[PDB]
Curated annotation (Swiss-Prot):
This is Histone H2B type 1-J. Coiled coil: none annotated. The keyword DNA-binding applies. The modification Phosphothreonine is found at T86. The modification Omega-N-methylarginine is found at R57, R63. The modification N6-(beta-hydroxybutyryl)lysine is found at K5, K56, K87, K91. Glycans are attached at S83. The modification N6-lactoyllysine is found at K14, K56, K79, K87, K91.
Amino acid sequence: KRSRKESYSIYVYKVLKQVHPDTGISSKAMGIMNSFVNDIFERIAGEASRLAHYNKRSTITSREIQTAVRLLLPGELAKHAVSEGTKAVTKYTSAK
DNA sequence: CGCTGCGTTTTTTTTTTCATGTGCCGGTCTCACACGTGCCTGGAGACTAGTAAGCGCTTCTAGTGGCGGTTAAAACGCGGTAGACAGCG
Ligand SMILES: [K+]
C-alpha cells in the first residue's frame, strides 16, 4: 500500500520497442527519458498557458500547443512535432 | 703573426628496437531488465448545462507612404604611429 508514484516509463518502452524492437534501456536511462518528458511537458503547458493569458483566453486549445511548439522547438524538430501533432488531432477527430 | 683547411671531436638527425599502454577476444558471476500477477485508482462514458469564443459590423487610430529642405553624418582617403605577431633567452 505504498504511495503510488506514476511515471511515463511504460510509454517510453512502448515507443523504444516501435523504433528499436531488439534494444532495451537501463533504469538510469529511463529515469532520464522520464525527466525529459516532464521537462518538455512543463515547457509547453507553460508557453501555451502564457499564449492564452496574453490573448485573454481561458481555454488552452491545440492551437495554443502548436504555437508553444513552434516557439520552444528548433527549425526541423518543430516542423515535424507540428506535423505528428496536426496528424494526431486530425486522426482523433475523424476516428470518432 | 694571421689565416686557412682539414682531420677531430662533438652535435644533429636518422633508423631500428623496444617497452607500454590499447583496445581486442572469449569464458564466470551478479543483480537489473523484463515479465507477470492481482488489486485499485484514475480515465472513459455519456449526458447535462452554462458559458467561452468566433465571426461580422462599427469606429476611428495609428500605421503606411510621400514630399521636399537643411544638416549632421557617412564616405573616402591620406598620412603617420603604436600595437599585433614573431622571434630570442
Ligand atoms: K490602426
